[PDB]
Structures are given as structure tokens and as C-alpha cells.
Design a protein that fits this description.
The protein contains 9 helices and 10 strands. By secondary structure, it is α+β, with helices and mostly antiparallel strands. It binds the ligand CCN(CC)CCNC(=O)c1c(C)[nH]c(/C=C2\C(=O)Nc3ccc(F)cc32)c1C. The site of the ligand CCN(CC)CCNC(=O)c1c(C)[nH]c(/C=C2\C(=O)Nc3ccc(F)cc32)c1C has 17 residues, from strand 1, strand 3, strand 5 and strand 6.
Length: 287
């Protein structure tokens, strides 16, 4: 398929027109796997927006750009990023989304140590989003702290839908090597048939990010870390001695090699660890 044919197929999914003259105050706030994210402002309303800008020509797998629009188009939820509009702008896909002033969990975790109340609050929000998406047959495949954004008041929102898979009656499982190395489930790494369970493993690795500050094997190269995850018992918290038994139990139900024995999102929502959640306000001091 030529670039022009791909762009034409993608055009069927975006809103028509050129958005440029409707926006001002373009400021870059983040780089990404598929493109840049800029803060901007609408003229007619004055509303701040995040504008993700992605070049159709420079993608690992350009078909995944459809996911940058379709998932948020199809799926709305309290803990899922809201999309306003999308456009084709020259040779770029632009996706306009709610501005989340708290930024990404990654930049909190590298800077300040979350307590267990905060970890529980983050996990509960992410699990609500995942329980919902999983029930619609969406496998996120890129759960990690970078995918998690915070509102000003400490509301947690799932983002970064580019790697999503939408399963179906005819294709109920995927087999493709998709994810970010250190967070990928062993069954994805082994190119086994897999489904929504892979997100629960990745969430477990994110819990390790929140406790230790880094995923397991982070000092290894991505391929070496993947071989270790493929071949080893589940990875352990460096700071296992610092965490409550209940958090330990919660994590051990996520980092289970056997994908069928691994807890579902819905099951984790009923876990005693999440009785430790705080009000969204408990994350505001991180922002
Ligand atoms: C000193 C700078 N700080 C720590 C390094 C904060 C850096 N981070 C920031 O400013 C920041 C802010 C304020 N928002 C975002 C990202 C998004 C947003 O708002 N809506 C979205 C919708 C989708 C999406 F995929 C990303 C975003 C970042 C990276």
C-alpha cells in the first residue's frame, strides 16, 4: 500500500479539515514512540488541549496509527483519556485530547516515592479502566507508568492506546510481539497465543516501578531483559521488605506466569489491598 492510499484510508477515520488556524500557543510537553505531544490553546473557547502529532511516514508499524484515534473514539470511561477531535494535517495525524495538568506517572515516580495508599489509588483507577476495556475485548499491551496521566485534582487516566489490539469472535487471541520490553508478559515475548491477561502482568511490572523506581532487569538491554522475563520465575521487588503483606499478595496475583491463573482486572478490584485507596486528593501532593 502506498503512502497516499494509507493516508486516504486513515482520512476515513479523522474529522475533516485543517485545525491550524483554530489553535495557538503551541508548546511541546512530551515526546513519544509514535510522535510528539504539544500543549496548545483553542481560539474560540480558550480551552487548553494536548495535541499529539504523528508522522505517517516514520512509524514502526503505520497501521497502528488507526489505534491512536479509534480506541478513544469507541471507548469512553472515567479513567480513560478523552479525545476531542482528530485531523490529518499535511503528512501528520493530529489527535486532540484533554490536557491533564498532572502529567505522566513516570515523571512522578522518578521524582517522589509513592506510599501504599497512593499506589492503591493508582491501581484502582487503572484496574477500572482495564476491567472496562477488557470487557470490550481491548488488549492495551503497553501498560507502564508512561501510559498513566493525572488530572490537576489527582484523577488517574489511562492513555497511549497505539499498541491496542481489538479481539473478536474470529480472532480471539493475538500472537504478535507488541509492547515495551521490560513490561511485556512472558507469553507475549514467547509469541504464544494471548489475550487480555497480558495487561495484568504489565500492571504488576508498573507496581514494581512504583515501589522500586524501575522495572525489573532495567540495567539489562531490552532483549536480554526479555530473555530473562521469558525464562525466569516472576521478578521480585527489590524493596519487598518495605511493603505490606497485603500489597505483596496483590502483586503476586498479577505476576503469575500461568496466564489463566493470573488474576483478572475484575478480580483485582475485589482485592483487600484496594481497601487502602485514598481519595484522589492523596495524589495531589505528587503533582
Ligand atoms: C518540568 C516538567 N514536568 C516534569 C518533567 C512535567 C512534564 N510533563 C508535562 O508537562 C505533561 C503534561 C502537563 N501533560 C502531559 C501529557 C498529556 C496531557 O496533558 N494530555 C494527554 C493526552 C494524551 C497523551 F498521550 C498525553 C497527554 C505531559 C507529558
Amino acid at each position: 500500500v502506498t503512502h497516499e492510499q494509507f493516508k486516504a484510508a486513515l482520512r476515513m477515520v479523522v474529522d475533516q479539515g485543517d485545525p491550524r488556524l483554530l489553535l495557538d500557543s503551541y508548546v511541546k510537553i512530551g515526546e513519544g514512540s509514535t510522535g510528539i505531544v504539544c500543549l496548545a490553546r483553542e481560539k474560540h473557547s480558550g480551552r487548553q488541549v494536548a495535541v499529539k502529532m504523528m508522522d505517517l511516514r516514520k512509524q514502526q508499524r503505520r497501521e497502528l496509527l488507526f489505534n491512536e484515534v479509534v480506541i478513544m473514539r469507541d471507548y469512553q470511561h472515567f479513567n480513560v483519556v478523552e479525545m476531542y477531535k482528530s485531523y490529518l494535517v499535511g503528512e501528520e495525524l493530529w489527535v486532540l485530547m484533554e490536557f491533564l495538568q498532572g502529567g505522566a506517572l513516570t515523571d512522578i515516580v522518578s521524582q517522589v516515592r509513592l506510599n501504599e495508599e497512593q499506589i492503591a489509588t493508582v491501581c484502582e483507577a487503572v484496574l477500572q479502566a482495564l476491567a472496562y476495556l477488557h470487557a470490550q475485548g481491548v488488549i492495551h499491551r503497553d501498560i507502564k507508568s508512561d501510559s498513566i496521566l493525572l488530572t490537576l485534582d489527582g484523577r488517574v487516566k489511562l492513555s497511549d492506546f497505539g499498541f491496542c489490539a481489538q479481539i473478536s469472535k474470529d480472532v480471539p487471541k493475538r500472537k504478535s510481539l507488541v509492547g515495551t520490553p521490560y513490561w511485556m508478559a512472558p507469553e507475549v515475548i514467547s509469541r504464544s497465543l494471548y489475550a487480555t491477561e497480558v495487561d495484568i502482568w504489565s500492571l504488576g511490572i508498573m507496581v514494581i516501578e512504583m515501589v522500586d523506581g524501575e522495572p525489573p532487569y532495567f540495567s539489562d538491554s531490552p532483549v536480554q531483559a526479555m530473555k530473562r522475563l521469558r525464562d525466569s520465575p516472576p521478578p521480585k521487588l527489590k524493596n519487598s521488605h518495605k511493603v505490606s503483606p497485603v500489597l505483596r499478595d496483590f502483586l503476586e496475583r498479577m505476576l503469575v506466569r500461568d496466564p489463566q491463573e493470573r488474576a483478572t482486572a475484575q478480580e483485582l478490584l475485589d482485592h483487600p489491598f484496594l481497601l487502602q485507596t485514598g481519595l484522589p486528593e492523596c495524589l495531589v501532593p505528587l503533582i
